[PDB]
A paper describes a structure:
L. pneumophila inhibits autophagy by injecting an effector protein called RavZ into the cytoplasm. RavZ functions as a cysteine protease and irreversibly deconjugates mammalian Atg8s from PE to inhibit autophagosome formation. Unlike Atg4 that cleaves the amide bond between terminal glycine and PE, RavZ cleaves the amide bond before glycine.
Next, we solved the structures of two RavZ fragments, 1–487 and 20–502. RavZ structures of both fragments are resolved from residues 47 to 433 and 48 to 432, respectively, whereas the missing regions at the N- and C-termini (residues 1–47 and 433–502) might be flexible and disordered. The C-terminal domain has been recently shown to be involved in association with phosphatidylinositol 3-phsphate (PI3P) and be essential for membrane binding. Structural alignment indicated that part of the N-terminal catalytic domain of RavZ (α2–α4, β6–β9) shows a similar fold to that of the core-lipid-binding domain of Sec14, consisting of 5 β-strands and 4 α-helices (α7–α10). Similarly in RavZ, helices α2 (corresponding to α7 of Sec14) and α4 (corresponding to α8 of Sec14) along β sheets form a large hydrophobic interface. However, the hydrophobic pocket is closed in RavZ, suggesting that a conformational change may be required to accommodate the fatty acid chains. It should be noted that the LBS of RavZ is closed without showing a binding pocket for lipid, whereas a clear hydrophobic binding cavity that can accommodate fatty acid chains is observed in free Sec14 structures.
Author numbering:
A (entry chain A), B (entry chain A): 48 to 248, 256 to 347, 356 to 432
Write the structure that this text describes.
């Protein structure tokens, strides 16, 4: 929908979708964030490209178009190689056709970044798998080179698939994808570069986001660096602790408009956290905590009720009372406890207060002696 | 779709859907199964009821209608009690209206069994939760009594929701559901009995199936027996080992037509396992095993290839060779190994052979000396 609500009790291993990914896009101009791109400026209203955010290299003439993720960017493949290679969703195919059309007239070299999902359609229930397509066109060669970046793992000799059995089984959407790309060009104007697939090792989504950040930055120049066999040592150095906290904190604790994100990437901008986000995040915690899992559910709830109250009384033409501050001080230990704690900690860090007490201490009307 | 394919690597904790549940319906006339109903005969073409399978109590005049599960039998509820109670999907509402209409003219007492799914619509991503509606009409009282059976757990004093906070949060679809039911009757002909909800303690789906089996059988007479506070000791005695193996084996290892199921319940019938099911199950194992996780993937694959080959060569006008049997004997250890093993064991048990060797030993053309 139009907003991207805080999902408490979300974590990296709980999977990615298009909305989440688009929400993480907000991290690109955040300086506190390990995904920050200062390799780049927003583009030149110039030539935009529908469905994609445009970028000029602070170093280069090189233009970088990064597509907003889409639920319809998807490729089904048949595992059984007797069946047809598969399908691509029509929108994806459309963006391919549109890229082709963009490059047919373009002076400056470019790189197009299309996060998508690939899935087996042969399996009783298949897993949708988050991966990354990038197409790079250069005007001198008239040449497009497709490349696809994939997380899951690499070729353990046991789970190694035989050359023979490769004849009988597809593990990827590569065949249908190559077909879609060759199809997007017939001016026969473009000589197609060679299709390649890069692999590592549902955390895959997070890796994909890191890869987007990598791909863009890596156009400073050369040397595309992903975990195995080229570049980074392990996937801990690549997707790091700060990377993971950044992502989880964005998705878990914030509340973001699509408008805020599009405005944030269509010009260079950070999106500072509003107090209203803190209120919404609390509210959501509240609504969840009343079902699932010491500190009793009823205690946690009374606490969040009170804190919400104080939090938006602050927002209005008013300022809070001595007695309300008393209650809050009674509640800070419940509020700093565990998950709810990590929540209020996120928000205090971003509102610039050391504690709740510090946060609400000003805006207290004391006028009564005692 | 029209078929219910074997889902290898499915287990009880992986959740339920309507197709799976409908497939488990096949277990009701299976004698090897702990869900077998010999409390009952198929009904009397008589009055049928669309969307539901009819039943006459071998003991009674009491009629039992058990609805085929439906993806559209669903109820959304708002957790936040400031919002409206929720919605019911129109089909569900329709079946309610239709039950009401069935009872308005009915001589014999009846019980209607409607498995469905209830979910929070307020939560960023909600869990669809499998539960069970039953409505029992009696012609003397002109009275319908709704009852809903729910798995998740019961009222741990910590996670106990306060009477006050019950004011602020709904945990169930009860409000909207009661509303739908009262709505299905205005002849104001029926005096509505009191709405109740029974709870225990995504395994919930399996519990629901057991409950269906319970509810039906429990109409032998009286005493509805579910785990806590009434009836059974624990949920191990209620949903038992044989229950769980039965369900898992049905869903994991069989391949069943909707037609086979409807024919199986519209007359009293077992659905004996065909050899073709064994072939399909193997095929599916094969297609999965080429992605995910000693015995190498390539070994497992060569084995399943060979076994499939021998398995449907058997099916035709032909019978297998000495050399093929040699190969198979080489492969039985790979085939009996682990998961693939539990598969072939299921199928041998149901085809009446002690091993693969026993199974394929007849149908071998030996004509060559040596
Ligand atoms: Ba297409
Ligand atoms: Ba070529
Ligand atoms: Ba309705
Ligand atoms: Ba009443």
């Amino acid at each position: 929908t139009s907003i991207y609500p805080p999902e408490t009790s979300w974590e990296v291993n709980k999977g990615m979708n298009s909305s989440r990914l688009h929400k993480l896009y907000s991290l690109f101009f955040d300086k506190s964030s390990a995904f920050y791109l200062g390799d780049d400026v927003s583009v030149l209203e110039d030539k935009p490209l529908t469905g994609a955010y445009g970028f000029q290299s602070k170093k280069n003439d090189q233009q970088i178009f990064l597509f907003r993720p889409d639920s319809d960017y998807v490729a089904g493949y048949h595992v059984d190689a007797k069946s047809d290679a598969g399908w691509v969703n029509d929108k994806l195919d459309r963006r391919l056709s549109e890229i082709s059309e963009f490059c047919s007239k373009a002076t400056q070299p470019a790189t197009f970044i299309l996060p998508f999902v690939e899935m087996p359609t042969d399996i009783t229930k298949g897993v949708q798998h988050q991966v990354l397509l990038t197409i790079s066109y250069d005007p001198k060669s008239k040449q497009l080179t497709p490349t696809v970046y994939d997380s899951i793992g690499r070729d353990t000799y046991s789970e190694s698939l035989s050359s023979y059995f490769k004849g009988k089984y597809r593990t990827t959407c590569d065949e249908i994808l190559t077909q879609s790309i060759e199809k997007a060009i017939k001016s026969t104007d473009f000589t197609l570069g060679k299709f390649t697939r890069a692999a590592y090792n549902g955390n895959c989504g997070s890796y994909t986001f890191r890869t987007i950040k990598e791909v863009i930055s890596s156009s400073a120049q050369g040397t595309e660096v992903k975990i195995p066999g080229s570049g980074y040592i392990t996937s801990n150095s690549y997707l790091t602790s700060q990377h993971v906290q950044d992502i989880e904190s964005c998705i878990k604790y914030r509340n973001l408009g699509v408008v805020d994100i599009e405005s944030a990437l269509t010009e260079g901008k950070t999106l500072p956290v509003q107090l209203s986000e803190f209120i919404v995040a609390l509210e959501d915690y509240g609504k969840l905590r009343s079902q699932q899992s010491g500190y009793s559910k009823t205690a946690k709830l009374t606490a969040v009720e009170l804190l919400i109250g104080i939090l938006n009384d602050i927002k209005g033409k008013n300022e809070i009372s001595e007695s309300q501050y008393d209650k809050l001080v009674k509640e800070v230990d419940c509020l700093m406890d565990s998950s709810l704690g990590k929540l209020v900690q996120f928000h205090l860090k971003n509102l610039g207060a050391e504690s709740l007490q510090k946060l609400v201490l000003p805006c207290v009307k004391f006028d009564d002696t005692i």
